[PDB]
Amino acid sequence: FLSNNSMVLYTDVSQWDSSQHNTQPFRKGIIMGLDMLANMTNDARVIQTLNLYKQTQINLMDSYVQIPDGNVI
Amino acid sequence: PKESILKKLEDIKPEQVKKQTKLFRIFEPRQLPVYRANGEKELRNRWYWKLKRDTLPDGDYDVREYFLNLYDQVLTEMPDYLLLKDMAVENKNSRDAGKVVDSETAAICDAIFQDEETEGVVRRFIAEMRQRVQADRNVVNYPSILHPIDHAFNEYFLQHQLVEPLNNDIIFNYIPERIRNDVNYILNMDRNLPSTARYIRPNLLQDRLNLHDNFESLWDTITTSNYILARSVVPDLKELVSTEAQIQKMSQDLQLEALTIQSETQFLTGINSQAANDCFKTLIAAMLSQRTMSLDFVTTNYMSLISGMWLLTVVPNDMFIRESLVACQLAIINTIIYPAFGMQRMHYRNGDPQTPFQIAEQQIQNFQVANWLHFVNNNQFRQVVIDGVLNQVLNDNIRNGHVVNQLMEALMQLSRQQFPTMPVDYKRSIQRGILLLSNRLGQLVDLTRLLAYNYETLMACITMNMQHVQTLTTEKLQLTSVTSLCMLIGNATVIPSPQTLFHYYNVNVNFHSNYNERINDAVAIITAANRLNLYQKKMKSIVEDFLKRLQIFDISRVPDDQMYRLRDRLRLLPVEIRRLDIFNLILMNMEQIERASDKIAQGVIIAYRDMQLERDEMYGYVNIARNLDGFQQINLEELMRTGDYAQITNMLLNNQPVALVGALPFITDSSVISLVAKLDATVFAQIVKLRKVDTLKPILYKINSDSNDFYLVANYDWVPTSTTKVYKQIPQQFDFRASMHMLTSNLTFTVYSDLLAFVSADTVEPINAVAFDNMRIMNEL
Amino acid sequence: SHEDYLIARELIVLSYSNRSTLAKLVSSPMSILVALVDINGTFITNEELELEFSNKYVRAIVPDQTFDELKQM
């Protein structure tokens, strides 16, 4: 698509892992998308595997990490 | 290196616009002491015009060589636009605060005001020397002091400028008419320019050299340049049908074996997407630059021959070279057509004047296949002149795509024939090959309409006169890669974006103006070095320079004889009107710049009889003959050219009156005893002893009051008399009240160069893009 | 080559003390220097992923603040 009237826009996000656009609105955009898929089906199994994939997002909403240094953890 | 011929085309800038910063001057005033009629020195001075940097060479031929070098200097000094508010210095001593037009003009105003012997009527004339500015019509009147030769050179730079006004209704007329009136392109603008905006228009007039006529090694490298530039403009195909989803569909109709689709039949060879884009580029770019194409194919391929019936029915036959158009037309007859009806195969020998598609429309009897075979023979470019540019258009049944409905009515009946000469396995391989085109009847009317729209549009961006002449080297077209375009295209329309049309147009303007501004710089020296009678200068070094400023040409390739044929056409052309009137102004007074010099003298007259010295107010007594009458002339230029010193030896020994004529150096003295001892007649004795006349230095006496032993003249009553005298002129007097001139120009311009940097164009949605008729291109599902 | 010897002498002497910020300073201006080189002929791809060769000419446009950043690097 390269020509003399166009431009390419490559951006280097520095800390992608811990930015503010990734903590609350990213885990609540997936959870809201699995509730519009619990009304589209009729099996009792497909509601269950869409509820367990939802359960891994509420638990990772407030996650603690463990880093050892010296004597303390 | 085809990536370096293209970089020589985007590196051609428009012509370097020059504005002059100082006035063109060739004379300057100078103070000289004056002497009265007796010889005594007056206690006053007077101003005389003198030459500025008077470097005149000796000999009558080197003075003609000097004015061709002066004519080059004035031609590289004339401005394209001139504003007199730039060159303006404050006048030092006036009635009010005024401005003269040059710094040299203010120097010789201050040098006359602060003088001691200058009379008051000149000193009062500098006080009333100021400018007048009109505001409703933006003109100014700046005074000057110039020589009347300098007044002619500096007024011609003012009345003849290369600037024209600029509006918004004249930017839209810069765009070509086939693109501005197109439906698919929407054209916008942002700013409206003022009334003081000016612009310089290029000279787009067609080539007067006729480089396509007998210059076949210069036309081949000037149409390769337009072939690479047209290849970087035509758009490339996106949204082609994928290759693996096309061969697998094509391998069900031919009923091939498993795993050996490439070895069982040679139908499916060289079908890529790289060769689909390559063939669409090299068919559009070969017609826009008139490079002759050439076909390569293998006769064992029955699919490269059916898709080779589509080129000859769409592309006109005068573009393919004849040794390969015949070998492609013959292989279709001996394989597809003549074994289909069952007749005998063609006995075609080399050098026959008729092509095999022109014999075989007489020996064939079917009606549907003799109409297609008739349109192939009578398919030709129709030369029409549009917007002053002869460009060759296609037929009206190829822009529509109606010709494919004549092709696939011919090979729809040729698939119907039963032929007895060939076995049942030769019938089944052609009948299945000819079916893959008839299944693409919809997507080849949409392909003929797409070549004829990306060639109608890019033809509107060229300015040079495209002429159709067979070239030396042919740009190669593989017939395999036409098969990979017929059965790989999809229903997606590509049309070139207008930021490419505005750039393909702006390269063709910068090359067509660089071409024309190098003809006019070489006609103007060739015609000037024949009017000035330069019989010894050879013109090989002013056409070798002309081929070099054109950026695409090579010098180490062209011979000597292809450079002296190009200057036999550079003479017959008329010179430009701006270059002629700056040369007729040199030639009219080329004997007033030569005669007003001190490093030269116009030949000696000798008479062996005592004649009186002519008294001037600047030389005292001087032996000067202002006119040369009553004496035999001997031209020195015709004496050094032939070397025949028999006439001048028999006349110097016999003591006869001669008048030698030529541009000659001289020495001066001031003694009086140098005149009584007659040191003027002893110079020409050397010509008899040694044949050479290049060593000749006559004596010019100058008996002033400050000369030593002048009391010999004032005491005894005698006027000084000499034997010989020099043909010399007297410098003009500097009148301050008659040399002022009011130079008129404008106040304010604003000169623009790139006019299409103001518009902002945009394409319509490419699924709705209409052809020359009402309907859209690529409409059939 | 001689160009490979002048690079290897600075990455052997300076690497004996500077174990933190040497591989970052040298590999920094490569994201900038790929935006200054002109295009004369390119490889492109179709919509389905198949190769094509296209020989357009695209001029490289760079603002005056990139060269005031490349001078800082």
PDB file of C-alpha atoms in Angstrom, chain B residues 131-362:
ATOM      1  CA  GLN B 131      11.790  57.889  -7.158  1.00  0.00           C
ATOM      2  CA  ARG B 132       8.056  58.015  -7.870  1.00  0.00           C
ATOM      3  CA  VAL B 133       5.843  55.187  -6.609  1.00  0.00           C
ATOM      4  CA  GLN B 134       2.373  54.610  -8.016  1.00  0.00           C
ATOM      5  CA  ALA B 135       0.182  52.480  -5.767  1.00  0.00           C
ATOM      6  CA  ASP B 136      -3.039  51.910  -7.731  1.00  0.00           C
ATOM      7  CA  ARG B 137      -0.952  50.486 -10.565  1.00  0.00           C
ATOM      8  CA  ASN B 138       1.998  48.907  -8.752  1.00  0.00           C
ATOM      9  CA  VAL B 139       4.828  50.522 -10.713  1.00  0.00           C
ATOM     10  CA  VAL B 140       7.901  52.486  -9.618  1.00  0.00           C
ATOM     11  CA  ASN B 141      10.215  54.887 -11.443  1.00  0.00           C
ATOM     12  CA  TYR B 142      13.827  54.600 -10.317  1.00  0.00           C
ATOM     13  CA  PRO B 143      16.439  56.879 -11.938  1.00  0.00           C
ATOM     14  CA  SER B 144      19.733  55.621 -13.338  1.00  0.00           C
ATOM     15  CA  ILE B 145      23.000  56.658 -14.938  1.00  0.00           C
ATOM     16  CA  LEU B 146      23.909  54.395 -17.853  1.00  0.00           C
ATOM     17  CA  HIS B 147      25.682  54.373 -21.179  1.00  0.00           C
ATOM     18  CA  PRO B 148      23.280  54.393 -24.158  1.00  0.00           C
ATOM     19  CA  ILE B 149      24.598  50.921 -25.025  1.00  0.00           C
ATOM     20  CA  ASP B 150      23.933  49.872 -21.417  1.00  0.00           C
ATOM     21  CA  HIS B 151      20.518  51.524 -21.635  1.00  0.00           C
ATOM     22  CA  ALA B 152      19.594  49.186 -24.491  1.00  0.00           C
ATOM     23  CA  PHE B 153      20.711  46.045 -22.650  1.00  0.00           C
ATOM     24  CA  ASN B 154      19.007  46.989 -19.372  1.00  0.00           C
ATOM     25  CA  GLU B 155      15.720  48.061 -20.939  1.00  0.00           C
ATOM     26  CA  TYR B 156      15.389  44.784 -22.833  1.00  0.00           C
ATOM     27  CA  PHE B 157      15.614  42.881 -19.542  1.00  0.00           C
ATOM     28  CA  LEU B 158      12.607  44.880 -18.255  1.00  0.00           C
ATOM     29  CA  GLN B 159      10.120  44.901 -21.141  1.00  0.00           C
ATOM     30  CA  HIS B 160      10.485  41.149 -21.795  1.00  0.00           C
ATOM     31  CA  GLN B 161       9.962  39.128 -18.613  1.00  0.00           C
ATOM     32  CA  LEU B 162       8.783  35.522 -18.410  1.00  0.00           C
ATOM     33  CA  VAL B 163       5.999  36.092 -15.842  1.00  0.00           C
ATOM     34  CA  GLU B 164       2.222  35.736 -16.296  1.00  0.00           C
ATOM     35  CA  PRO B 165      -0.512  36.241 -13.668  1.00  0.00           C
ATOM     36  CA  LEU B 166      -1.975  33.404 -11.614  1.00  0.00           C
ATOM     37  CA  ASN B 167      -5.554  32.705 -10.497  1.00  0.00           C
ATOM     38  CA  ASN B 168      -7.631  29.716  -9.415  1.00  0.00           C
ATOM     39  CA  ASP B 169      -9.245  29.360 -12.846  1.00  0.00           C
ATOM     40  CA  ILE B 170      -5.753  28.971 -14.354  1.00  0.00           C
ATOM     41  CA  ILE B 171      -4.520  26.276 -11.952  1.00  0.00           C
ATOM     42  CA  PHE B 172      -7.406  24.042 -13.029  1.00  0.00           C
ATOM     43  CA  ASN B 173      -6.427  24.571 -16.670  1.00  0.00           C
ATOM     44  CA  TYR B 174      -2.955  23.182 -15.905  1.00  0.00           C
ATOM     45  CA  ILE B 175      -4.450  19.706 -15.310  1.00  0.00           C
ATOM     46  CA  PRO B 176      -5.117  17.795 -18.575  1.00  0.00           C
ATOM     47  CA  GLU B 177      -8.612  17.862 -20.003  1.00  0.00           C
ATOM     48  CA  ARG B 178      -9.214  14.101 -20.091  1.00  0.00           C
ATOM     49  CA  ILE B 179      -8.519  13.880 -16.341  1.00  0.00           C
ATOM     50  CA  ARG B 180     -10.237  17.038 -15.093  1.00  0.00           C
ATOM     51  CA  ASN B 181     -13.457  16.140 -16.942  1.00  0.00           C
ATOM     52  CA  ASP B 182     -13.310  12.540 -15.703  1.00  0.00           C
ATOM     53  CA  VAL B 183     -16.120  11.302 -13.492  1.00  0.00           C
ATOM     54  CA  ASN B 184     -14.068   9.081 -11.158  1.00  0.00           C
ATOM     55  CA  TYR B 185     -11.780  11.876  -9.895  1.00  0.00           C
ATOM     56  CA  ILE B 186     -13.005  14.575  -7.497  1.00  0.00           C
ATOM     57  CA  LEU B 187     -10.813  17.687  -7.506  1.00  0.00           C
ATOM     58  CA  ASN B 188     -10.622  20.037  -4.518  1.00  0.00           C
ATOM     59  CA  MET B 189      -8.757  23.251  -3.704  1.00  0.00           C
ATOM     60  CA  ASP B 190      -7.981  25.055  -0.468  1.00  0.00           C
ATOM     61  CA  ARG B 191      -6.645  28.595  -0.970  1.00  0.00           C
ATOM     62  CA  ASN B 192      -7.354  31.367  -3.462  1.00  0.00           C
ATOM     63  CA  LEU B 193      -4.243  33.223  -4.559  1.00  0.00           C
ATOM     64  CA  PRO B 194      -3.992  37.052  -4.638  1.00  0.00           C
ATOM     65  CA  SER B 195      -3.874  39.317  -7.684  1.00  0.00           C
ATOM     66  CA  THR B 196      -0.083  39.723  -7.373  1.00  0.00           C
ATOM     67  CA  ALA B 197       0.683  36.020  -7.829  1.00  0.00           C
ATOM     68  CA  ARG B 198       2.775  35.242 -10.909  1.00  0.00           C
ATOM     69  CA  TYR B 199       4.054  32.066 -12.545  1.00  0.00           C
ATOM     70  CA  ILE B 200       6.364  31.006 -15.373  1.00  0.00           C
ATOM     71  CA  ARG B 201       4.913  28.888 -18.166  1.00  0.00           C
ATOM     72  CA  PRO B 202       7.004  26.149 -19.811  1.00  0.00           C
ATOM     73  CA  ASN B 203       7.396  25.947 -23.577  1.00  0.00           C
ATOM     74  CA  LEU B 204       5.711  22.695 -24.601  1.00  0.00           C
ATOM     75  CA  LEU B 205       6.117  22.651 -28.371  1.00  0.00           C
ATOM     76  CA  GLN B 206       6.858  19.412 -30.186  1.00  0.00           C
ATOM     77  CA  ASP B 207      10.306  18.271 -31.256  1.00  0.00           C
ATOM     78  CA  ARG B 208      11.802  20.068 -34.246  1.00  0.00           C
ATOM     79  CA  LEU B 209      14.761  17.720 -34.689  1.00  0.00           C
ATOM     80  CA  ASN B 210      12.690  14.678 -35.763  1.00  0.00           C
ATOM     81  CA  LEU B 211      14.794  12.261 -33.743  1.00  0.00           C
ATOM     82  CA  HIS B 212      12.720   9.303 -34.962  1.00  0.00           C
ATOM     83  CA  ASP B 213      13.806   9.977 -38.566  1.00  0.00           C
ATOM     84  CA  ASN B 214      17.179   8.299 -39.351  1.00  0.00           C
ATOM     85  CA  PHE B 215      18.452   8.737 -35.756  1.00  0.00           C
ATOM     86  CA  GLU B 216      17.857   5.164 -34.688  1.00  0.00           C
ATOM     87  CA  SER B 217      20.513   4.881 -31.974  1.00  0.00           C
ATOM     88  CA  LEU B 218      19.316   8.104 -30.315  1.00  0.00           C
ATOM     89  CA  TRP B 219      15.644   7.157 -30.554  1.00  0.00           C
ATOM     90  CA  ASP B 220      16.203   3.746 -28.962  1.00  0.00           C
ATOM     91  CA  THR B 221      17.681   5.285 -25.811  1.00  0.00           C
ATOM     92  CA  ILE B 222      15.032   8.029 -25.661  1.00  0.00           C
ATOM     93  CA  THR B 223      12.124   5.563 -25.792  1.00  0.00           C
ATOM     94  CA  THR B 224      13.679   3.196 -23.272  1.00  0.00           C
ATOM     95  CA  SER B 225      13.602   6.206 -20.948  1.00  0.00           C
ATOM     96  CA  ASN B 226       9.860   6.641 -21.516  1.00  0.00           C
ATOM     97  CA  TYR B 227       9.332   2.889 -21.083  1.00  0.00           C
ATOM     98  CA  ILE B 228      10.838   2.602 -17.602  1.00  0.00           C
ATOM     99  CA  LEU B 229       9.078   5.764 -16.425  1.00  0.00           C
ATOM    100  CA  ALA B 230       5.730   4.486 -17.712  1.00  0.00           C
ATOM    101  CA  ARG B 231       6.351   1.171 -15.927  1.00  0.00           C
ATOM    102  CA  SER B 232       6.560   2.861 -12.503  1.00  0.00           C
ATOM    103  CA  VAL B 233       3.144   4.507 -12.957  1.00  0.00           C
ATOM    104  CA  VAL B 234       0.701   1.818 -14.206  1.00  0.00           C
ATOM    105  CA  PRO B 235      -0.932   0.241 -11.128  1.00  0.00           C
ATOM    106  CA  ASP B 236      -0.219  -3.300 -10.028  1.00  0.00           C
ATOM    107  CA  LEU B 237      -2.896  -5.921  -9.534  1.00  0.00           C
ATOM    108  CA  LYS B 238      -4.180  -6.670  -6.076  1.00  0.00           C
ATOM    109  CA  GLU B 239      -7.058  -9.086  -5.407  1.00  0.00           C
ATOM    110  CA  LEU B 240      -6.059 -11.698  -7.945  1.00  0.00           C
ATOM    111  CA  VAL B 241      -7.519 -15.178  -7.661  1.00  0.00           C
ATOM    112  CA  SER B 242      -5.124 -17.451  -5.772  1.00  0.00           C
ATOM    113  CA  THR B 243      -3.025 -19.909  -7.752  1.00  0.00           C
ATOM    114  CA  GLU B 244      -3.721 -23.084  -5.768  1.00  0.00           C
ATOM    115  CA  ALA B 245      -7.474 -22.451  -5.816  1.00  0.00           C
ATOM    116  CA  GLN B 246      -7.247 -21.962  -9.602  1.00  0.00           C
ATOM    117  CA  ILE B 247      -5.084 -24.889 -10.722  1.00  0.00           C
ATOM    118  CA  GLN B 248      -7.194 -27.286  -8.642  1.00  0.00           C
ATOM    119  CA  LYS B 249     -10.289 -25.916 -10.393  1.00  0.00           C
ATOM    120  CA  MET B 250      -8.437 -26.168 -13.712  1.00  0.00           C
ATOM    121  CA  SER B 251      -7.331 -29.759 -13.057  1.00  0.00           C
ATOM    122  CA  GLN B 252     -10.918 -31.030 -12.844  1.00  0.00           C
ATOM    123  CA  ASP B 253     -11.839 -29.884 -16.354  1.00  0.00           C
ATOM    124  CA  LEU B 254      -8.768 -31.438 -17.985  1.00  0.00           C
ATOM    125  CA  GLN B 255      -9.131 -34.672 -15.917  1.00  0.00           C
ATOM    126  CA  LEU B 256      -5.450 -34.843 -15.018  1.00  0.00           C
ATOM    127  CA  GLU B 257      -3.835 -37.550 -12.934  1.00  0.00           C
ATOM    128  CA  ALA B 258      -3.045 -37.149  -9.258  1.00  0.00           C
ATOM    129  CA  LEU B 259       0.279 -35.601  -8.135  1.00  0.00           C
ATOM    130  CA  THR B 260       1.471 -34.927 -11.726  1.00  0.00           C
ATOM    131  CA  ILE B 261      -0.497 -31.878 -12.830  1.00  0.00           C
ATOM    132  CA  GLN B 262       2.727 -30.238 -14.071  1.00  0.00           C
ATOM    133  CA  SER B 263       4.181 -33.193 -16.009  1.00  0.00           C
ATOM    134  CA  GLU B 264       1.115 -34.841 -17.579  1.00  0.00           C
ATOM    135  CA  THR B 265       0.005 -31.750 -19.502  1.00  0.00           C
ATOM    136  CA  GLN B 266       2.167 -28.726 -20.240  1.00  0.00           C
ATOM    137  CA  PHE B 267      -0.986 -26.600 -20.017  1.00  0.00           C
ATOM    138  CA  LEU B 268      -0.231 -25.495 -16.450  1.00  0.00           C
ATOM    139  CA  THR B 269       3.248 -24.018 -16.663  1.00  0.00           C
ATOM    140  CA  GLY B 270       4.426 -20.591 -15.546  1.00  0.00           C
ATOM    141  CA  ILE B 271       1.081 -19.656 -13.973  1.00  0.00           C
ATOM    142  CA  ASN B 272       2.095 -17.376 -11.086  1.00  0.00           C
ATOM    143  CA  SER B 273       0.909 -14.095  -9.661  1.00  0.00           C
ATOM    144  CA  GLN B 274       4.343 -12.576 -10.306  1.00  0.00           C
ATOM    145  CA  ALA B 275       3.842 -13.078 -14.046  1.00  0.00           C
ATOM    146  CA  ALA B 276       0.259 -11.795 -14.009  1.00  0.00           C
ATOM    147  CA  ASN B 277       1.368  -8.397 -12.731  1.00  0.00           C
ATOM    148  CA  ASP B 278       4.387  -8.443 -15.054  1.00  0.00           C
ATOM    149  CA  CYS B 279       2.259  -8.874 -18.193  1.00  0.00           C
ATOM    150  CA  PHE B 280      -0.272  -6.177 -17.304  1.00  0.00           C
ATOM    151  CA  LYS B 281       2.563  -3.713 -16.729  1.00  0.00           C
ATOM    152  CA  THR B 282       4.435  -4.581 -19.924  1.00  0.00           C
ATOM    153  CA  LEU B 283       1.348  -4.255 -22.139  1.00  0.00           C
ATOM    154  CA  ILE B 284       0.325  -0.832 -20.824  1.00  0.00           C
ATOM    155  CA  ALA B 285       3.885   0.527 -20.726  1.00  0.00           C
ATOM    156  CA  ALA B 286       4.786  -0.758 -24.186  1.00  0.00           C
ATOM    157  CA  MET B 287       1.910   1.132 -25.814  1.00  0.00           C
ATOM    158  CA  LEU B 288       2.555   4.397 -23.943  1.00  0.00           C
ATOM    159  CA  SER B 289       6.200   4.494 -25.058  1.00  0.00           C
ATOM    160  CA  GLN B 290       5.927   2.651 -28.425  1.00  0.00           C
ATOM    161  CA  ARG B 291       8.530   0.017 -27.591  1.00  0.00           C
ATOM    162  CA  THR B 292       8.055  -2.864 -29.995  1.00  0.00           C
ATOM    163  CA  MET B 293       7.333  -6.100 -28.159  1.00  0.00           C
ATOM    164  CA  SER B 294       8.421  -9.645 -28.991  1.00  0.00           C
ATOM    165  CA  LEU B 295       6.733 -12.951 -28.194  1.00  0.00           C
ATOM    166  CA  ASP B 296       8.388 -16.093 -26.846  1.00  0.00           C
ATOM    167  CA  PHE B 297       6.490 -19.365 -26.559  1.00  0.00           C
ATOM    168  CA  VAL B 298       6.851 -23.122 -26.962  1.00  0.00           C
ATOM    169  CA  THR B 299       4.941 -24.769 -29.810  1.00  0.00           C
ATOM    170  CA  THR B 300       4.268 -27.883 -27.681  1.00  0.00           C
ATOM    171  CA  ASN B 301       2.014 -25.743 -25.440  1.00  0.00           C
ATOM    172  CA  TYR B 302      -1.617 -25.778 -26.545  1.00  0.00           C
ATOM    173  CA  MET B 303      -2.646 -23.315 -23.816  1.00  0.00           C
ATOM    174  CA  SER B 304      -0.080 -20.657 -24.728  1.00  0.00           C
ATOM    175  CA  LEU B 305      -1.590 -20.572 -28.234  1.00  0.00           C
ATOM    176  CA  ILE B 306      -5.246 -20.121 -27.259  1.00  0.00           C
ATOM    177  CA  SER B 307      -4.314 -17.279 -24.914  1.00  0.00           C
ATOM    178  CA  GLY B 308      -2.109 -15.993 -27.733  1.00  0.00           C
ATOM    179  CA  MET B 309      -5.239 -15.505 -29.807  1.00  0.00           C
ATOM    180  CA  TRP B 310      -6.310 -12.877 -27.272  1.00  0.00           C
ATOM    181  CA  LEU B 311      -3.285 -10.588 -27.699  1.00  0.00           C
ATOM    182  CA  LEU B 312      -3.563 -10.407 -31.488  1.00  0.00           C
ATOM    183  CA  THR B 313      -7.265  -9.527 -31.279  1.00  0.00           C
ATOM    184  CA  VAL B 314      -6.775  -6.769 -28.670  1.00  0.00           C
ATOM    185  CA  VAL B 315      -3.262  -5.349 -29.067  1.00  0.00           C
ATOM    186  CA  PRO B 316      -2.673  -3.976 -32.597  1.00  0.00           C
ATOM    187  CA  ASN B 317      -0.385  -6.046 -34.797  1.00  0.00           C
ATOM    188  CA  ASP B 318       2.012  -3.226 -35.729  1.00  0.00           C
ATOM    189  CA  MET B 319       3.643  -3.399 -32.287  1.00  0.00           C
ATOM    190  CA  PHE B 320       4.929  -6.973 -32.381  1.00  0.00           C
ATOM    191  CA  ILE B 321       8.054  -7.529 -34.453  1.00  0.00           C
ATOM    192  CA  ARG B 322       7.482  -9.379 -37.707  1.00  0.00           C
ATOM    193  CA  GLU B 323       9.839 -12.332 -37.209  1.00  0.00           C
ATOM    194  CA  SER B 324       7.878 -13.247 -34.051  1.00  0.00           C
ATOM    195  CA  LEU B 325       4.368 -12.133 -35.016  1.00  0.00           C
ATOM    196  CA  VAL B 326       4.527 -14.462 -38.025  1.00  0.00           C
ATOM    197  CA  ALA B 327       5.904 -17.390 -36.008  1.00  0.00           C
ATOM    198  CA  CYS B 328       3.060 -16.926 -33.504  1.00  0.00           C
ATOM    199  CA  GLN B 329       0.391 -16.498 -36.193  1.00  0.00           C
ATOM    200  CA  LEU B 330       1.619 -19.578 -38.068  1.00  0.00           C
ATOM    201  CA  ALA B 331       1.626 -21.871 -35.031  1.00  0.00           C
ATOM    202  CA  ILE B 332      -2.034 -21.074 -34.314  1.00  0.00           C
ATOM    203  CA  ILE B 333      -2.972 -22.029 -37.883  1.00  0.00           C
ATOM    204  CA  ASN B 334      -1.083 -25.336 -38.021  1.00  0.00           C
ATOM    205  CA  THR B 335      -2.402 -26.452 -34.606  1.00  0.00           C
ATOM    206  CA  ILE B 336      -5.747 -24.856 -33.707  1.00  0.00           C
ATOM    207  CA  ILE B 337      -7.461 -23.728 -36.919  1.00  0.00           C
ATOM    208  CA  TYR B 338      -6.380 -25.705 -40.001  1.00  0.00           C
ATOM    209  CA  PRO B 339      -6.505 -29.128 -38.252  1.00  0.00           C
ATOM    210  CA  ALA B 340      -9.973 -28.192 -36.956  1.00  0.00           C
ATOM    211  CA  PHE B 341     -11.616 -28.007 -40.382  1.00  0.00           C
ATOM    212  CA  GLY B 342      -9.495 -30.834 -41.785  1.00  0.00           C
ATOM    213  CA  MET B 343      -7.663 -29.033 -44.581  1.00  0.00           C
ATOM    214  CA  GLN B 344      -3.996 -29.420 -45.474  1.00  0.00           C
ATOM    215  CA  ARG B 345      -1.427 -27.752 -43.242  1.00  0.00           C
ATOM    216  CA  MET B 346       0.186 -24.478 -44.237  1.00  0.00           C
ATOM    217  CA  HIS B 347       3.214 -24.482 -46.539  1.00  0.00           C
ATOM    218  CA  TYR B 348       4.547 -21.121 -45.386  1.00  0.00           C
ATOM    219  CA  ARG B 349       8.044 -20.139 -46.521  1.00  0.00           C
ATOM    220  CA  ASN B 350      10.166 -17.345 -45.074  1.00  0.00           C
ATOM    221  CA  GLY B 351       9.966 -13.811 -46.391  1.00  0.00           C
ATOM    222  CA  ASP B 352       6.439 -14.085 -47.767  1.00  0.00           C
ATOM    223  CA  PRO B 353       4.745 -10.661 -48.004  1.00  0.00           C
ATOM    224  CA  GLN B 354       1.496 -11.916 -46.420  1.00  0.00           C
ATOM    225  CA  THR B 355       1.073 -12.936 -42.788  1.00  0.00           C
ATOM    226  CA  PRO B 356      -0.493 -16.354 -42.048  1.00  0.00           C
ATOM    227  CA  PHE B 357      -3.629 -14.665 -40.666  1.00  0.00           C
ATOM    228  CA  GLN B 358      -3.992 -12.936 -44.041  1.00  0.00           C
ATOM    229  CA  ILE B 359      -3.617 -15.927 -46.350  1.00  0.00           C
ATOM    230  CA  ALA B 360      -5.874 -18.066 -44.157  1.00  0.00           C
ATOM    231  CA  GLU B 361      -8.864 -15.734 -44.389  1.00  0.00           C
ATOM    232  CA  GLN B 362      -9.013 -16.483 -48.123  1.00  0.00           C
TER     233      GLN B 362
END
